[PDB]
Amino acid sequence: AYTNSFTRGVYYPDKVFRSSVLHSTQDLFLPFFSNVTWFHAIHVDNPVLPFNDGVYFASTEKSNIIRGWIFGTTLDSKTQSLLIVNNATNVVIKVCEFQFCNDPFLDFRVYSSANNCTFEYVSQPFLKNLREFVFKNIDGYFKIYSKHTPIDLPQGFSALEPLVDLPIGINITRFQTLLALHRSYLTPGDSSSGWTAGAAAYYVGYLQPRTFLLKYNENGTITDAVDCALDPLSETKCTLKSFTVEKGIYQTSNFRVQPTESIVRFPNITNLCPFDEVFNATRF
Amino acid sequence: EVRLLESGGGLVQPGGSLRLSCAASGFTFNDYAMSWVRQAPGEGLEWVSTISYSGGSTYYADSVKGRFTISRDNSKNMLYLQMNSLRAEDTALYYCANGVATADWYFDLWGRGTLVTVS
Amino acid sequence: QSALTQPRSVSGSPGQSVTISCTGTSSDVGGYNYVSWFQHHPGKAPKLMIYDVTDRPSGVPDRFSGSKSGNTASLTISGLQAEDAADYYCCSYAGTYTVFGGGTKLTVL
Amino acid sequence: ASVYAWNRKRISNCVADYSVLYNFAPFFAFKCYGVSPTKLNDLCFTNVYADSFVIRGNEVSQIAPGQTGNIADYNYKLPDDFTGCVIAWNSNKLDSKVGGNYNYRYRLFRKSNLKPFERDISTEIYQAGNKPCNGVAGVNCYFPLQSYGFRPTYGVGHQPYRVVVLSFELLHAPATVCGPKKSTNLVKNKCVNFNFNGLTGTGVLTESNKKFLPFQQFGRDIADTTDAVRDPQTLEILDITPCSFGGV
Numbered sequence: 099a100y101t102n103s104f105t106r107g108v109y110y111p112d113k114v115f116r117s118s119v120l121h122s123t124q125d126l127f128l129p130f131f132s133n134v135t136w137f138h139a140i141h142v143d144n145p146v147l148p149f150n151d152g153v154y155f156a157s158t159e160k161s162n163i164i165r166g167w168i169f170g171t172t173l174d175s176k177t178q179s180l181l182i183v184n185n186a187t188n189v190v191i192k193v194c195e196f197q198f199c200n201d202p203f204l205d206f207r208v209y210s211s212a213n214n215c216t217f218e219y220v221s222q223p224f225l226k227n228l229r230e231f232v233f234k235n236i237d238g239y240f241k242i243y244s245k246h247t248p249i250d251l252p253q254g255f256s257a258l259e260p261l262v263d264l265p266i267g268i269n270i271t272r273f274q275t276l277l278a279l280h281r282s283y284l285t286p287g288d289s290s291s292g293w294t295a296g297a298a299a300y301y302v303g304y305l306q307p308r309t310f311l312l313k314y315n316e317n318g319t320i321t322d323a324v325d326c327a328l329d330p331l332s333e334t335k336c337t338l339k340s341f342t343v344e345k346g347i348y349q350t351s352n353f354r355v356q357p358t359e360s361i362v363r364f365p366n367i368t369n370l371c372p373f374d375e376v377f378n379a380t381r382f
Numbered sequence: 383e384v385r386l387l388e389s390g391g392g393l394v395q396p397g398g399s400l401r402l403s404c405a406a407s408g409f410t411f412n413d414y415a416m417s418w419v420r421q422a423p424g425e426g427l428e429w430v431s432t433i434s435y436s437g438g439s440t441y442y443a444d445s446v447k448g449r450f451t452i453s454r455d456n457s458k459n460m461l462y463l464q465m466n467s468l469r470a471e472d473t474a475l476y477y478c479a480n481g482v483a484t485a486d487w488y489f490d491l492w493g494r495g496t497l498v499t500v501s
Numbered sequence: 502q503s504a505l506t507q508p509r510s511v512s513g514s515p516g517q518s519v520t521i522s523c524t525g526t527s528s529d530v531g532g533y534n535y536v537s538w539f540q541h542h543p544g545k546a547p548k549l550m551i552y553d554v555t556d557r558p559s560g561v562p563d564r565f566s567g568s569k570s571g572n573t574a575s576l577t578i579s580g581l582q583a584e585d586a587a588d589y590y591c592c593s594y595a596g597t598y599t600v601f602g603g604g605t606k607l608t609v610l
Numbered sequence: 611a612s613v614y615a616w617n618r619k620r621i622s623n624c625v626a627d628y629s630v631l632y633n634f635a636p637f638f639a640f641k642c643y644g645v646s647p648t649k650l651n652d653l654c655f656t657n658v659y660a661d662s663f664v665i666r667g668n669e670v671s672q673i674a675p676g677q678t679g680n681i682a683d684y685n686y687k688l689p690d691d692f693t694g695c696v697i698a699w700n701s702n703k704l705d706s707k708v709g710g711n712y713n714y715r716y717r718l719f720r721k722s723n724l725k726p727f728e729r730d731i732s733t734e735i736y737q738a739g740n741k742p743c744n745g746v747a748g749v750n751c752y753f754p755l756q757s758y759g760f761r762p763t764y765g766v767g768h769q770p771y772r773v774v775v776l777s778f779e780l781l782h783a784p785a786t787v788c789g790p791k792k793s794t795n796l797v798k799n800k801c802v803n804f805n806f807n808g809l810t811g812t813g814v815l816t817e818s819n820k821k822f823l824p825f826q827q828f829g830r831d832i833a834d835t836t837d838a839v840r841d842p843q844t845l846e847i848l849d850i851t852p853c854s855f856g857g858v
Contacts, residue, residue: 114782115822115829115838260825265620265657317821415708417599426504426590427547429599432708439709441597477546484552486707487535487594487762492546535762596763 099136103128103303104251107154108312108323109232109243109258118316120339122326126234126305128154130325139163139277139298142290143201146173149273152305155231156251159298162186162225165205166276171269173198175211178268180240183276184224191219193266199286202274204293206284217266232258234305238267251301257320275300311336384408386478386493390463395501398468404461404478404493412436412456414480417489418463420498422474430476431463435486446472468500505530505574505591505602512608513581520577521605523591529600530593531572537592538567538576539601540585547590551576583609613663613685614717614755615731621658627651627790635699638771639670642695645778650695651789654808656781658694661686661727662774664705664714666758668767670698673775684717684754689726694777702762705770710759714770719754727777783827784842793843801853806839811850818847 107128137144139159147153149169157164170179175197182191194213203209224244228251232243243258282293309326326336333350334343387405394400404416417432431452432441440452449472451464461478475495481488505525513519523530523538530536538551549558551567554574568575574591586609591602611617628650640647665673665681672681675692682688705711719736732754735743739750747753760770785807798815818838822829829838829847839848 110825112782113825113827115820115826117820119832259823318823318826426502426604427541427601429601432599434709435707436709436712443598484549484558485703485762487599488537488549488552490549490558495546594762 100133101136101251101301103130103132103134103154103301104253105130105255105323106156106230106251107232107258107303107305108255108310108320110260110320113260115318116314117318119314120311121314122309122311122336122339124307124309126152126236127308127310127325128232128303129306129308130328132303134301134303136301137299139295139300141292141295143204143277143288143292144275146272146274147302149235149270150304151236151307152232152234153273154303154305155233155300157229157231157298157300158227158249159229159296159300160227161296161298163277163279163296163298164275164300165278167273168198168202168276169268169270169273171271173272178214178216180266180268180270186223186225188223189221191264193217193268201288202276203284203286204282205276205278206282209284209286217264219264221262228252230258232305233273235270238265240264240266240270255322309336311339313341384482384491386461386480386491388476388478388493388496391476391496391498393499393501394468396468396470398500399464399466400468400498402463402465402476402478402496402498404463406459406461409482409491411454411459411461414482414491415486416452416454416461417441417479418450418452418461418476419479419489420472420474420476421495422471425474428474433461465498468498470500472498473500474498502603503600504604505593505600507589507591507602507605509603510606510608512610513578513585515581515583515609517581518577518579519581519607520575521589521607523574523576523602525572525574525591525593525600525602527572529572529595530569530574532595533593534569535594536567536569536574537594538565538574539590539592541588541590541604543588550589552592578607581609585609611663612713612715613665613681614715616661616663616686616729619660619662621660622786624787625790626653626655626658626787631697637697637699638667639698640695641674643675644693645695647695652791652808653778653787653789654785655778655787656783656785657779658787659777659779660774661777662772664701664770664772665716666760666764666768667700667771670771670773673698673773680718681716683723684720684730685724687724687726687728688775692777693780694775696773696775698771698773700766700769701772702760702766702769705772706760706762706764708762710757710761711770712757712759714758714760715755716758717754718756719752796841796844804850807842809836809839811836813850813852816849816851818849820847822847 111123111125166183168181171177175195178193178195180193192215194215196213197211199209226249228247228249230245234241241263242261244261245256245258279293279295311324311326312320313322315321324332324335326333334348335341337350385407388402390400390402413435415432415434418430419427420430421427430443430446431450433452433454437454437456442450449467453462465472475497477495478493479489480491483490505523507523511519511521534554536554539547540550541547550561550565552558554569555567557565564578564580566577578585586607588604588606590604593600669681672679673696675688676690717730720730724730735745735747736752736754737743738752741750743751801812801814803812822840827840831837836850
């Protein structure tokens, strides 16, 4: 399915406090008004989605049916894949190149081959309530931002706070989600039949390099943002560095049609040159 | 712990043939060059032969060249010396040695020695 | 032999100093700095006292020192003790072969 | 480690005093880049990466920002922005062997150069000719790795050298690696020289009245002027104001 994503996805990018000031930053953000895929949590277990540059994962659920994720460049043990699983007691993040089954196991708590872990970590758990997450991994670190809010996606603006900064430098290229279920059978391989589970849904969006104008309030919290490259009005606000523009004419930028082709032109004189006959001289 | 043990000495008639062995224990035999050094009664130490850590390189002393053959079994942690055409000047106490604690070209590790008598 | 040329005998009284010389060729002593000195008692394994013209392995006192000039190496033993009496051999690694000196008998009277 | 498959260790959560490597070998080279080494006891770095491998002395020139060659291109590549120091020393006595140490290898063939800090451990045949090598070598098709074969008969240029390249990565958060120093009782309401985890300055320190969120470590007014700081000991927010000055 599809649904446009409103003004969501903004997060504190640099953990430095600023009060009652406007700041423009170029980073990987979620472009405003972009449509996002919508999925339901009944059965098919779940297909893999590429990790282009960063994922904005929102979920409205009330029974902890979704409990983790799995990332890596491949599901086989041929590469140091990653494991991240939340729980009622704590969160468990693991990187052990565990080979996976034909399908991700449906919780019967684990189904994977042997491991050769290089990093392991544990911490407190992540617990009508709209949970939002932003996953980013660019500079050798994998970073998480999050927010839990009471309540479709609301139009209200709210920024995510940096939750965890992990140092793992694995090359992530594909990603999947992890579900759970009560009294469910578990097998290394299964068809699209699945097992019964509660009604639930999760949205997915893809991040892009954009320039954002962020507004900090007197208490250091982000209250509004403008996508500098969305439409001409936003670009004018972003240029004047002011959310309110008065009547007038403004020179915002310049445009230039790009070249559509490249051509090379060389003469026809081939013939090799005598190089290995001067360097290979016997007497200089 | 780390040990070298020579073996295979005995009385043999001149021009005969003998095989010496050196038994390694306590270290990675195949990581180290092995050498045979002997000491003939009344004479000083004499380097006889050196084999590299792999086994693909064998060095011998001229005084025993041709007639002596060095070998090693890195699977069994064993070094060997095949002495053929044994002459009377080959009567000696025979040692195996390596450089486990210093450098490949030194003799810091030694065996106990094997006595070789050529009649 | 082909050994490095050493004095056959040197004698010293306990507490005094003695220097022992080792002359070889341009392919061993005068080629590399891979010169060794050995303390030896017939019937037991030699003990390395000096390897590398002037360097002592672990456990060798600074009373033992080594030197080299040209094709000649030199070992000097200071503070002579009764247990220093032994046979001393220089040694040179030359790449394609190792060569020991002919040995100097040190007697501590 | 071999240079083609070079080892990386992240160092963190500790104090970096370098008086140890000063009681270490006669160094072949200490070429340090973008930082004075004699000041490497007041470091306050966030992350430090320790890449390690062995080469011969003739090849140490390739270990530098913006260098070229078999090592720099197909084995170990450094970025042009390198901020760190390179320490190297002859390890001939331990790593050279009689017939050559053939356990140390390096990549001879690669279709493209590595990106900075990239690692290629592939062992797949190389095509120097125009015949597709189907997992087979021979004429014009080569194995991409080659052993050094360190021998005691080599010159010092061809002798094994152990190399450690320390990359100092900057940041804006807890310098989880800092230098051997000490702390002093905090002073307020006086023009004082302060050193908060590396930030040196002058000014009057005052108790803060602004609500820093638990994940923030610095405070700024307009134009990046450091206005506040959280204590690395009392974890308390402090206001910074430059002490009085003016024209006469």
